[PDB]
Amino acid sequence: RPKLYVMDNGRMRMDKNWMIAMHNPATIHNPNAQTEFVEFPIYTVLIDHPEGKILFDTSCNPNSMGPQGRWAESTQQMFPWTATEECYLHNRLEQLKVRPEDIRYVVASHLHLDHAGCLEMFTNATIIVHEDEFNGALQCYARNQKEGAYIWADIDAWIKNNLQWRTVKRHEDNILLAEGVKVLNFGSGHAWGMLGLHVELPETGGIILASDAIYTAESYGPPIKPPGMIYDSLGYMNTVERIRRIAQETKSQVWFGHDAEQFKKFRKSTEGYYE
Amino acid sequence: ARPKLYVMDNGRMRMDKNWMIAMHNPATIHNPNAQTEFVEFPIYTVLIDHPEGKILFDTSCNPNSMGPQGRWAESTQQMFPWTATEECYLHNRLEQLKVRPEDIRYVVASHLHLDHAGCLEMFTNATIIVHEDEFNGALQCYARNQKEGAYIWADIDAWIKNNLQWRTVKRHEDNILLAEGVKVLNFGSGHAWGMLGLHVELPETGGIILASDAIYTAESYGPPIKPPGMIYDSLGYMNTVERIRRIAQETKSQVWFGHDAEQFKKFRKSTEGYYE
Ligand SMILES: [Co+2]
Ligand SMILES: [Co+2]
Ligand SMILES: [Fe+3]
Ligand SMILES: [Fe+3]
């Protein structure tokens, strides 16, 4: 039945303390400990499903970087994004002969700059997002916050393009989107409200798309190593452990948000698909 | 009641500023290998000489914490070194006030971190007041034979061997009137598993809130609030800081932070006097 494509949406760099909290602490014999600017991949997933095409995440906006870019300069220097034209999401979809108007459902894991970048392309889709994440992002917009992980100009475009929203409620059960495709309601942790995805493929079997609920394999452990970028510490831990249980009980792979080694291994959209 | 409140200097500690102020100086494209700093801060305790009986808030570090024969693990000693002359040790500070450990009726343990619960074992004639969630969490560290981290196995060992008398504050228990104008504040989860504070109403000085590690420094307090890297419950921490800010406003109280160097310098310490 379905076909699942991994699309390469370029690379981002940032302080590795964001990724792994207190990774290299200062000591009496190393009092001025230095950090490192680590590279990690930005990616999206397309599930070409009989019942309709499902897109997980949307990467960054093409108009994000540069002196005429949407991102504030402080954001550009703290979380720089590098991508060729081939990396842009509209192009990756074009090379698969898929038009934006063909996307039935977009699942926004959360509304950070590197996942919600291109929501505005999908004017014929239902956009699925946690309600707490939505509220949080809209407050950023209304309070006219121009820095941080929530891009004012992105949100501005969502409203102008008249996107059709479907909020997952705080205490809402998981949503069966299609045969073998479930939206997981992870709630608060990394951000205000996280969504994941469990995909059951005939040949490949079970896949959990965790997004920023688990950055990397180092995050996952055990033991768990939580990030510096975090809203609800307790929630974050509960979520990781919950994914570990689901993985075991359903014999599923766990696909992390930004794991460089794992990403290299993936079969990309320019080479083929999973089935 | 006409009490006297004393601030006692129990030495200094140093650690990565990222523990104290999370992501205080993040790396950027043009400064990729940004360095941190190793900041110094005070360790102190408060004595309330009250007519109904003497109350002690926190107990600093154990005299035999540091060194090759030290209770603290080497890794701990290197990340959180404590420097203190003999006169800084709690038992000496009390002596210089003609106070013996057996004179202490109540010990309020803000939490059970290495720099607050170090000297509980001295007070075998007191009721030790502690948050039940903090007490439980420390005991698990003990039972699991965890020898590294902020909860000192040898300290806990001694509390047990010395048969301390405990009184746990329950998770949803209200504030506890310990004496005229002395209330134990139940802050719950945040920096650690279970935080306690103290509100003190002095005739002359007025209101005082002892926050301990619920609020590290003035930099923590803001506004805006700047949370620590050393954090268990992030939401609870934020909730607690705003709660303290409210109480402070409504009761016209000063807020004494856990480890503010500037504020500590301005305090009248036990070698100079007290607060009435
Ligand atoms: Co994110
Ligand atoms: Co502490
Ligand atoms: Fe991300
Ligand atoms: Fe402390």
Author numbering:
A (entry chain A): 9 to 283
B (entry chain C): 8 to 283
Question: From the publication, what sentences describe this entry?
Answer:
MLLs degrade N-acyl-L-homoserine lactones (AHLs), molecules that are used in a microbial communication system called quorum sensing (QS) to coordinate a variety of behaviors, including virulence and biofilm formation. We provide the structural and biochemical analysis of the lactonase GcL (WP_017434252.1), isolated from the thermophilic bacteria Parageobacillus caldoxylosilyticus. GcL is a thermostable, highly proficient lactonase with broad substrate specificity (kcat/KM values range between 104 to 106 M–1 s–1) for substrates such as N-butyryl (C4) L-homoserine lactone (HSL) and N-decanoyl (C10)-HSL. The binuclear center, common to all MLLs, is coordinated by five histidine residues and two aspartic acid residues.
We report here the kinetic characterization of several variants, including Ala157Gly, Ala157Ser, Gly156Pro and Ile237Met. While some of these variants show only modest changes in lactonase activity compared to the wild-type for several AHL substrates (e.g., Ile237Met), they show altered kinetics for specific substrates, resulting in changes in substrate preference. To gain some molecular insights into the effects of these substitutions on the active site configuration, structures were solved for both Gly156Pro and Ile237Met variants. On the other hand, the Ile237Met variant shows a slightly altered conformation of the Pro234-Asp240 loop, in the vicinity of the amide group of the AHL substrate. This conformational change is more distant from the atoms of a long acyl chain AHL substrate, and this is, therefore, consistent with the minimal changes in catalytic properties recorded for this variant. Following this, when considering the locations of the amino acid substitutions performed in the variants studied here, two of them (Tyr223Phe and Asp122Asn) are part of the first hydrophobic subsite where the lactone ring is accommodated, Ile237Met is located at the second hydrophobic subsite, and the rest (Gly156Pro, Ala157Gly and Ala157Ser) are located in the third hydrophilic subsite.
